[PDB]
C-alpha cells in the first residue's frame, strides 16, 4: 500500500519495496530478510529513519519515527569511548543486528 501510494510522486527517490506483509503475523525471519536486502543494496546510508504506527490503544495510534544510525556515527560518537572491546568490526556487526531488531520492532507495532 505505502509503495503504491508513494511510488508515483516519489519514484526516483526509491531503492526497494516489499510485499506479502500483513497476511501473516510478522516474525523475525521477515525482519532479517529485510535487513539483508537493505544492506545488500549498494547504498551506504549515513543516517536513516523508520516510520511506523506506534500502537497506543485499541482506538489510538501515533505515527512515530525512530532513528537509525550508521557505523561511523556510533564509532565517532565521543560518548562511545566508555564502551569496551569496541572496534569497527564489532560495531558493524552490532549495527546490522540492531537494524534488523528495529525493523522487527516496527513491524510488530
Amino acid at each position: 500500500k505505502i509503495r503504491g501510494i508513494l511510488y508515483r510522486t516519489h519514484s526516483d527517490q526509491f531503492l526497494v519495496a516489499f510485499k506479502e506483509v500483513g497476511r501473516k503475523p510478522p516474525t523475525f525471519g521477515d525482519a532479517s530478510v529485510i535487513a539483508l536486502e537493505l544492506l545488500n543494496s549498494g547504498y551506504e546510508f549515513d543516517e536513516g529513519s523508520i516510520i511506523f504506527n506506534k500502537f497506543r490503544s485499541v482506538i489510538s495510534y501515533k505515527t512515530e519515527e525512530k532513528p537509525i544510525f550508521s557505523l561511523n556515527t556510533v564509532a565517532s560518537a565521543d560518548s562511545m569511548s566508555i564502551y569496551d572491546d569496541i572496534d569497527a568490526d564489532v560495531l558493524q556487526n552490532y549495527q546490522e543486528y540492531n537494524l534488523a531488531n528495529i525493523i522487527y520492532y516496527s513491524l510488530k507495532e
Binding site: 566508555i82 564502551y83 569496551d84 572491546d85 569496541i86 564489532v90 560495531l91 552490532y94 543486528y97
Partner: peptide, 12 residues
C-alpha cells in the same frame, strides 16, 4: 562473564 558494575561494553 558479566557481574555488577561491569565495564560498559557491547558485543555480538
Amino acid at each position: 562473564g558479566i557481574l555488577a558494575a561491569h565495564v560498559p561494553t557491547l558485543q555480538v
